[PDB]
Amino acid sequence: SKEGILTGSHWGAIRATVKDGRFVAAKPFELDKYPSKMIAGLPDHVHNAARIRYPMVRVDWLRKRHLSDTSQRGDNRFVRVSWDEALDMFYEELERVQKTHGPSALLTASGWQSTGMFHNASGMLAKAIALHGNSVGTGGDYSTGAAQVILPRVVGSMEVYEQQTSWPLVLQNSKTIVLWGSDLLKNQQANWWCPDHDVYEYYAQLKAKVAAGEIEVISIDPVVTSTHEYLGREHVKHIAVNPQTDVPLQLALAHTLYSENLYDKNFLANYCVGFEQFLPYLLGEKDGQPKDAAWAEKLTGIDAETIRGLARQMAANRTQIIAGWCVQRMQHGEQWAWMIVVLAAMLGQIGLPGGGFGFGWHYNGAGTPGRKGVILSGFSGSTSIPPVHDNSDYKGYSSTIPIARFIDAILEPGKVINWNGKSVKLPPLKMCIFAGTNPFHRHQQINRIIEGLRKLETVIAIDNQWTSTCRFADIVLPATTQFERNDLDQYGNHSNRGIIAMKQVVPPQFEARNDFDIFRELCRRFNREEAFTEGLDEMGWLKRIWQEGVQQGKGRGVHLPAFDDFWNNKEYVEFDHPQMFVRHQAFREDPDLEPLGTPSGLIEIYSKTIADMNYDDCQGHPMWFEKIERSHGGPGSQKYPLHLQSVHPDFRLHSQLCESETLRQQYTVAGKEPVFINPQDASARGIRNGDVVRVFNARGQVLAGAVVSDRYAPGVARIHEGAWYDPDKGGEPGALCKYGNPNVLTIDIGTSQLAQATSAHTTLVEIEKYNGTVEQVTAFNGPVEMVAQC
Ligand SMILES: NC1=NC(=O)C2=N[C@H]3C(S)=C(S)[C@@H](COP(=O)(O)OP(=O)(O)OC[C@H]4O[C@@H](n5cnc6c(=O)[nH]c(N)nc65)[C@H](O)[C@@H]4O)O[C@H]3NC2=N1
Ligand SMILES: NC1=NC(=O)C2=N[C@H]3C(S)=C(S)[C@@H](COP(=O)(O)OP(=O)(O)OC[C@H]4O[C@@H](n5cnc6c(=O)[nH]c(N)nc65)[C@H](O)[C@@H]4O)O[C@H]3NC2=N1
Ligand SMILES: [Mo+6]
């Protein structure tokens, strides 16, 4: 049939080939010099056994609805129903919950979904429900849950998703680059809008500068990252810090900087507040313990003199701090993010090209010069009319909670917690809807999630693959992939390089529907179809989005062609006039005219506002707090001696494309997710490559396939997140996961009272070669379909 069909995804733009109605090969877009291997999984993603073929309802839920046996969730026994029957039940449940409980019982949830301006699954969900009634909202996300709360308070920006100093300037000016828990090479494969991958050009240049010894790269990381491996182990200075001891390391660098007069007094005095209130802590005047190189050597396992050497090197020349997000996705994650800023402040290079800090470097091609282009605005969740049932009665519970507290809300309703200076009362949720997110991938401590779901009346999942979420649902609705629809997207993110047409590759498979059509038909049930669609279909909406784009471009001085011209004749437009950027430079150059958005206008090393909250676990300046569990001598490490990283996958985006055999064949071990193990740790357990091992703690147990790797320091392991949950006894708490989802082993706790964010990477485990029976993996084969024989 058809060859060279242009479209896009989180993993990049493709030229798709179709043969006899099947998507068979995905070639890289011709402008993409650095495509991701993951595009090879996209045909499988469209055509594999886990694709949701039709609406499905959990046997006993179909029988008894909200009066059903919730214990059977997870058993994977579902009945096919018609679309109209499914949508009716959906509507009737919305009606029932609104009448019985009101808006405090209802939660929606969304996530990374797919690229595409119109086919915005989160927007479809939010709009449809918002046209029916009120619900519990959430604040924050799992990416930068801690950082995005603390950083506004201390540097007046969210920071984490923002543009970074242009790489050309970094490469011409920085002499030391500090990668602090950041894997650029691995994580720039997938971006929010279709990636252009042009940032990899800069990484190649960096590689050459490293080889020539012009730039020294320091990696502060328990593991040799993909980036480190790429730049070269012979060249990269590796600080293999003990997991979760980064704050001690930060404080000791700060101490050294002060102790040896390497700090910038002028910068601290003129661009910051509160340094004087922090120093007594740092120096041990108010506790007897200097937060010094000697002190930190005990915690971090880094030689004190190496700590001092690091500080001195950072101060000695132009130094770029590149901070990732993983180190704030753990207990008290705000502390580490805050100390990145403090350390950068003490160095005094903030606002210089290739100096200072940033958190956005691994995301959205950050550091690529931004072009003078157009950014389209997609289908919004926003409504202009009130809900049909506009009940404001949340019965004395809060109407917004932190995103990661939703299970705590189900299990501990009425619990009162602090959140970033406010008081929150967790509502008794009864009905959850998921569209474009996978909770059994995303959230922590799956056995507790199981217990939480068992208190729910109704669970609805809408997806294009039969995920672990779908396995634990009551109603499952088949959404399409983006490859079965038409759309528009940005090409490039921070670069704003271009815009691409997403042309339909194949027709909707089976009776899968675009989320637009799902929620449109739902809205018809309560007479709000028109308010949802705004009188437009797919191609109408795409034309509307483009035209708004055309209007934005005129008056910004960028000319776009007409829609039909673009769609049918061009398919791709590219922008020009790339701009250099230096982050924080405006503030550095004129702090009076360009103040930070902080209480003082300055960098808050001490925050009176935070101090006044009276949170013992997030005080007025950064502090070392001991963790609920930590490796290398921390709590629990006598029982569970290994730190388990749940790092972002190299061969998927989260749980997406786990079902691809094309990709799995490249990294699976014994048919399972690989677990990475240090050679000394492996030899102590008699473990070797290919072994089926049990990774366990007091929270859960999983099976995985051992990879013995010297990239891992002793006492550090990894199972990449996104490995699907596959319980041996479906639905039972304490089931052994046969594929190896790390969130079976994580703990579900708030970072601190400030952010109340996910602490996913605060995880201790043991590993042993497994002595039980290895059953077949059942993760990727859909449900057990059930039929009425009567
Ligand atoms: N390929 C790919 N897959 C994805 O799933 C993906 N997801 C995207 C999203 S949504 C996000 S949030 C980002 C992920 O952003 P994030 O920064 O979380 O990335 P990771 O690669 O998981 O972790 C970065 C590094 O932290 C290190 N690290 C772990 N624990 C510690 C510790 O205690 N101390 C120190 N110093 N380092 C530590 C890890 O070893 C790793 O090299 O990537 C984005 N890009 C993505 N690309
Ligand atoms: N242990 C642990 N460590 C971690 O580092 C960690 N990181 C966290 C982070 S940073 C993030 S971003 C979250 C990610 O959590 P998130 O839930 O966002 O992850 P995905 O696996 O991308 O799930 C998206 C789902 O939407 C579906 N989908 C895609 N397109 C569509 C569409 O058009 N319509 C519909 N209806 N569905 C669609 C996909 O099939 C997929 O199942 O995981 C978090 N969880 C984490 N846990
Ligand atoms: Mo994220």
Author numbering: 49 to 838
Task: Quote the study on this structure.
We solved the X-ray structure of E. coli TorA and performed chemical crosslinking of TorA and TorC. The two chains present in the asymmetric unit were oriented toward each other such that one molecule (chain A) covered the entrance to the other molecule’s (chain B) active site. Both active sites had clear electron density for the Mo ion coordinated by bis-MGD and serine 191 (1.7 Å from Mo), but no obvious density for a sulfido ligand. The sulfido-containing bis-MGD is highly sensitive to oxygen and may have been damaged during the long time required for crystallization (>1 month). While the solvent-accessible active site (chain A) had a malate moiety at 2.8–2.9 Å from Ser191(OH) and at 3.5–3.9 Å from Mo (distance from carboxyl group to Ser and Mo), the covered active site (chain B) had a water molecule at 2.6 Å from Mo and at 2.2 Å from Ser191(OH). This was supported by the crystal structure in which these residues were not defined in the electron density. We therefore replaced the generated TorA model by the TorA crystal structure for further analysis of the TorA-TorC complex.
TMAO reduction involves a membrane-associated pentahemic c-type cytochrome TorC and a molybdenum-containing periplasmic enzyme TorA as a terminal reductase. TorA belongs to the DMSO reductase family of molybdoenzymes and can reduce only TMAO, unlike R. capsulatus DorA, the DMSO reductase in this bacterium which reduces both N- and S-oxides. TorC is required for anaerobic growth in the presence of TMAO; it shuttles electrons from the menaquinone pool to TorA in the periplasm.
